[PDB]
CSV table of all heavy atoms in Angstrom, one decimal:
chain,number,residue,atom,x,y,z
A,25,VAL,N,-8.3,-3.0,-0.8
A,25,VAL,CA,-7.9,-3.4,0.5
A,25,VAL,C,-8.7,-4.5,1.1
A,25,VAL,O,-9.7,-4.9,0.7
A,25,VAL,CB,-8.0,-2.0,1.4
A,25,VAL,CG1,-7.0,-0.9,0.9
A,25,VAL,CG2,-9.4,-1.6,1.4
A,26,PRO,N,-8.1,-5.1,2.1
A,26,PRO,CA,-8.7,-6.2,2.9
A,26,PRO,C,-10.1,-5.8,3.4
A,26,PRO,O,-10.3,-4.6,3.6
A,26,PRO,CB,-7.7,-6.5,4.1
A,26,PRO,CG,-6.4,-6.0,3.6
A,26,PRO,CD,-6.8,-4.8,2.8
A,27,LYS,N,-10.9,-6.7,3.7
A,27,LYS,CA,-12.2,-6.3,4.2
A,27,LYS,C,-12.4,-5.5,5.4
A,27,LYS,O,-13.3,-4.7,5.7
A,27,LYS,CB,-13.1,-7.5,4.5
A,27,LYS,CG,-13.6,-8.2,3.2
A,27,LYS,CD,-14.2,-9.5,3.7
A,27,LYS,CE,-15.1,-10.2,2.5
A,27,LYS,NZ,-15.7,-11.5,3.0
A,28,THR,N,-11.3,-5.5,6.3
A,28,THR,CA,-11.2,-4.7,7.5
A,28,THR,C,-10.8,-3.3,7.3
A,28,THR,O,-10.7,-2.5,8.3
A,28,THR,CB,-10.4,-5.4,8.5
A,28,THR,OG1,-9.0,-5.5,8.0
A,28,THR,CG2,-10.8,-6.8,8.9
A,29,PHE,N,-10.5,-3.0,6.1
A,29,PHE,CA,-10.2,-1.6,5.7
A,29,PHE,C,-11.4,-1.2,4.6
A,29,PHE,O,-12.1,-1.9,4.2
A,29,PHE,CB,-8.9,-1.3,5.0
A,29,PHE,CG,-7.7,-1.9,5.8
A,29,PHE,CD1,-7.5,-3.3,5.7
A,29,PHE,CD2,-6.9,-1.1,6.5
A,29,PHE,CE1,-6.4,-3.9,6.3
A,29,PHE,CE2,-5.8,-1.8,7.2
A,29,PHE,CZ,-5.5,-3.1,7.1
A,30,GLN,N,-11.4,0.1,4.4
A,30,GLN,CA,-12.2,0.7,3.3
A,30,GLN,C,-11.5,1.7,2.4
A,30,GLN,O,-10.6,2.5,3.1
A,30,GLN,CB,-13.6,1.4,3.8
A,30,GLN,CG,-14.5,1.6,2.8
A,30,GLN,CD,-15.7,2.3,3.3
A,30,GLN,OE1,-15.6,3.4,3.8
A,30,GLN,NE2,-16.8,1.7,3.3
A,31,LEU,N,-11.7,1.7,1.2
A,31,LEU,CA,-11.0,2.5,0.2
A,31,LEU,C,-11.9,3.4,-0.6
A,31,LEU,O,-13.0,2.9,-0.9
A,31,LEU,CB,-9.9,1.8,-0.6
A,31,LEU,CG,-9.2,2.3,-1.7
A,31,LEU,CD1,-7.9,1.4,-1.9
A,31,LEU,CD2,-10.1,2.2,-3.0
A,32,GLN,N,-11.6,4.6,-0.9
A,32,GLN,CA,-12.2,5.5,-1.8
A,32,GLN,C,-11.3,6.0,-2.8
A,32,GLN,O,-10.3,6.6,-2.5
A,32,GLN,CB,-12.9,6.7,-1.3
A,32,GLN,CG,-13.6,7.7,-2.3
A,32,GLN,CD,-14.0,9.0,-1.6
A,32,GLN,OE1,-13.4,9.4,-0.7
A,32,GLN,NE2,-15.0,9.6,-2.2
A,33,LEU,N,-11.5,5.7,-4.1
A,33,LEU,CA,-10.6,6.1,-5.1
A,33,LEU,C,-11.2,7.3,-5.9
A,33,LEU,O,-12.2,7.3,-6.4
A,33,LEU,CB,-10.4,5.0,-6.1
A,33,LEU,CG,-9.3,5.1,-7.2
A,33,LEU,CD1,-7.9,5.2,-6.6
A,33,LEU,CD2,-9.4,3.9,-8.2
A,34,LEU,N,-10.4,8.4,-5.9
A,34,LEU,CA,-10.8,9.6,-6.6
A,34,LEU,C,-10.3,9.6,-8.1
A,34,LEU,O,-9.7,8.6,-8.4
A,34,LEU,CB,-10.3,10.9,-5.9
A,34,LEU,CG,-10.7,11.0,-4.4
A,34,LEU,CD1,-10.3,12.2,-3.8
A,34,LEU,CD2,-12.2,10.8,-4.2
A,35,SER,N,-10.6,10.6,-8.9
A,35,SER,CA,-10.3,10.6,-10.3
A,35,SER,C,-8.8,11.0,-10.6
A,35,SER,O,-8.3,11.8,-10.0
A,35,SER,CB,-11.3,11.6,-11.0
A,35,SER,OG,-12.6,11.3,-10.8
A,36,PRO,N,-8.3,10.2,-11.6
A,36,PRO,CA,-6.9,10.4,-12.0
A,36,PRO,C,-6.8,11.7,-12.8
A,36,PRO,O,-7.7,12.2,-13.3
A,36,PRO,CB,-6.6,9.2,-12.8
A,36,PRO,CG,-7.9,8.9,-13.4
A,36,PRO,CD,-9.0,9.2,-12.5
A,37,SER,N,-5.6,12.2,-12.8
A,37,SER,CA,-5.3,13.4,-13.6
A,37,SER,C,-5.5,13.2,-15.1
A,37,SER,O,-5.8,14.2,-15.8
A,37,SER,CB,-3.9,13.9,-13.2
A,37,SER,OG,-2.9,12.9,-13.5
A,38,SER,N,-5.2,12.1,-15.6
A,38,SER,CA,-5.4,11.7,-17.0
A,38,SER,C,-5.3,10.3,-17.2
A,38,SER,O,-5.3,9.6,-16.2
A,38,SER,CB,-4.3,12.5,-17.9
A,38,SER,OG,-3.2,11.7,-17.9
A,39,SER,N,-5.4,9.9,-18.4
A,39,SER,CA,-5.3,8.4,-18.8
A,39,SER,C,-4.0,8.1,-19.6
A,39,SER,O,-4.0,7.1,-20.2
A,39,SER,CB,-6.5,8.0,-19.5
A,39,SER,OG,-6.6,8.6,-20.7
A,40,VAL,N,-3.1,9.0,-19.6
A,40,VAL,CA,-1.8,8.8,-20.4
A,40,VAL,C,-0.6,8.9,-19.6
A,40,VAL,O,-0.5,10.0,-18.9
A,40,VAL,CB,-1.7,9.7,-21.6
A,40,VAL,CG1,-0.4,9.4,-22.4
A,40,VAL,CG2,-2.9,9.5,-22.6
A,41,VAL,N,0.2,7.9,-19.5
A,41,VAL,CA,1.6,8.1,-18.8
A,41,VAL,C,2.6,8.3,-20.0
A,41,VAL,O,2.8,7.4,-20.8
A,41,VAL,CB,2.0,6.9,-18.0
A,41,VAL,CG1,3.1,7.3,-17.0
A,41,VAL,CG2,0.8,6.3,-17.2
A,42,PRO,N,3.1,9.6,-20.1
A,42,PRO,CA,3.8,10.0,-21.2
A,42,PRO,C,5.3,9.2,-21.2
A,42,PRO,O,5.8,9.0,-20.3
A,42,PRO,CB,3.9,11.4,-21.2
A,42,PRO,CG,3.9,11.8,-19.8
A,42,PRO,CD,2.9,10.8,-19.3
A,43,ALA,N,5.8,9.0,-22.4
A,43,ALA,CA,7.1,8.4,-22.7
A,43,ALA,C,8.2,9.2,-22.0
A,43,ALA,O,8.1,10.5,-21.9
A,43,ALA,CB,7.3,8.3,-24.2
A,44,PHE,N,9.2,8.5,-21.7
A,44,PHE,CA,10.5,9.1,-21.2
A,44,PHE,C,10.2,10.2,-20.1
A,44,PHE,O,10.9,11.2,-20.1
A,44,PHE,CB,11.2,9.9,-22.4
A,44,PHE,CG,11.7,8.9,-23.5
A,44,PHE,CD1,11.3,9.2,-24.8
A,44,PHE,CD2,12.6,7.8,-23.2
A,44,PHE,CE1,11.8,8.3,-25.8
A,44,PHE,CE2,13.1,7.1,-24.2
A,44,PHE,CZ,12.7,7.3,-25.5
A,45,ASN,N,9.4,9.9,-19.1
A,45,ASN,CA,9.3,10.7,-17.9
A,45,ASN,C,9.0,12.1,-18.1
A,45,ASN,O,9.5,12.9,-17.4
A,45,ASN,CB,10.6,10.5,-17.0
A,45,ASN,CG,10.7,9.1,-16.5
A,45,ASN,OD1,9.9,8.8,-15.6
A,45,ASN,ND2,11.6,8.4,-17.0
A,46,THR,N,8.2,12.5,-19.2
A,46,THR,CA,7.9,13.8,-19.4
A,46,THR,C,6.7,14.3,-18.6
A,46,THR,O,6.3,15.5,-18.7
A,46,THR,CB,7.7,14.1,-20.9
A,46,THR,OG1,6.6,13.3,-21.4
A,46,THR,CG2,9.0,13.8,-21.8
A,47,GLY,N,6.1,13.4,-17.8
A,47,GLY,CA,4.8,13.8,-17.1
A,47,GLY,C,4.4,12.5,-16.4
A,47,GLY,O,5.0,11.5,-16.5
A,48,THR,N,3.4,12.8,-15.4
A,48,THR,CA,3.0,11.7,-14.6
A,48,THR,C,1.5,11.7,-14.7
A,48,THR,O,0.8,12.6,-15.2
A,48,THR,CB,3.3,11.9,-13.2
A,48,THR,OG1,2.7,13.0,-12.7
A,48,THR,CG2,4.9,11.9,-13.0
A,49,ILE,N,0.9,10.6,-14.1
A,49,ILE,CA,-0.5,10.5,-13.7
A,49,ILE,C,-0.5,10.5,-12.2
A,49,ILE,O,0.2,9.8,-11.6
A,49,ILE,CB,-1.2,9.2,-14.2
A,49,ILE,CG1,-1.3,9.2,-15.7
A,49,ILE,CG2,-2.6,9.1,-13.5
A,49,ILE,CD1,-2.1,8.1,-16.3
A,50,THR,N,-1.3,11.4,-11.6
A,50,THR,CA,-1.6,11.4,-10.2
A,50,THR,C,-3.0,11.0,-9.9
A,50,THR,O,-3.9,11.3,-10.7
A,50,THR,CB,-1.3,12.6,-9.5
A,50,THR,OG1,-2.2,13.7,-10.0
A,50,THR,CG2,0.2,13.1,-9.7
A,51,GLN,N,-3.3,10.4,-8.7
A,51,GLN,CA,-4.6,10.0,-8.3
A,51,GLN,C,-4.5,9.7,-6.8
A,51,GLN,O,-3.6,9.2,-6.3
A,51,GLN,CB,-4.9,8.7,-9.1
A,51,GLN,CG,-6.3,8.2,-8.9
A,51,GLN,CD,-6.8,7.1,-9.8
A,51,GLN,OE1,-5.9,6.5,-10.5
A,51,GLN,NE2,-8.0,6.8,-9.8
A,52,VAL,N,-5.6,10.2,-6.2
A,52,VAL,CA,-5.8,10.1,-4.7
A,52,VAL,C,-6.6,8.9,-4.4
A,52,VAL,O,-7.6,8.6,-5.0
A,52,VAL,CB,-6.3,11.4,-4.2
A,52,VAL,CG1,-6.7,11.3,-2.7
A,52,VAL,CG2,-5.4,12.6,-4.4
A,53,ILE,N,-6.1,8.2,-3.3
A,53,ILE,CA,-6.8,7.1,-2.6
A,53,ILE,C,-7.0,7.5,-1.2
A,53,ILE,O,-6.1,7.9,-0.5
A,53,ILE,CB,-6.0,5.9,-2.5
A,53,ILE,CG1,-5.2,5.6,-3.8
A,53,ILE,CG2,-6.9,4.6,-2.2
A,53,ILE,CD1,-4.3,4.3,-3.7
A,54,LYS,N,-8.2,7.4,-0.6
A,54,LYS,CA,-8.5,7.6,0.7
A,54,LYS,C,-8.7,6.2,1.4
A,54,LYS,O,-9.5,5.4,1.0
A,54,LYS,CB,-9.7,8.5,1.0
A,54,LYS,CG,-9.4,9.9,0.4
A,54,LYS,CD,-10.4,11.0,0.8
A,54,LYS,CE,-9.9,12.3,0.2
A,54,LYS,NZ,-10.4,13.5,1.0
């Protein structure tokens, strides 16, 4: 984000985005 904002990135659910929409990766940003 620009310097006038601040961000914290939390841990992703995994490191694989599976083929053909069989699952997702989720991850939270504050």
Side-chain angles (χ1 to χ4, degrees):
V25 292
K27 283 172 166 173
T28 61
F29 309 81
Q30 192 183 63
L31 174 153
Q32 176 192 28
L33 189 62
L34 304 185
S35 300
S37 58
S38 83
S39 63
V40 178
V41 197
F44 294 127
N45 290 290
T46 60
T48 65
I49 296 182
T50 62
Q51 189 172 6
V52 172
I53 321 174
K54 299 191 172 204

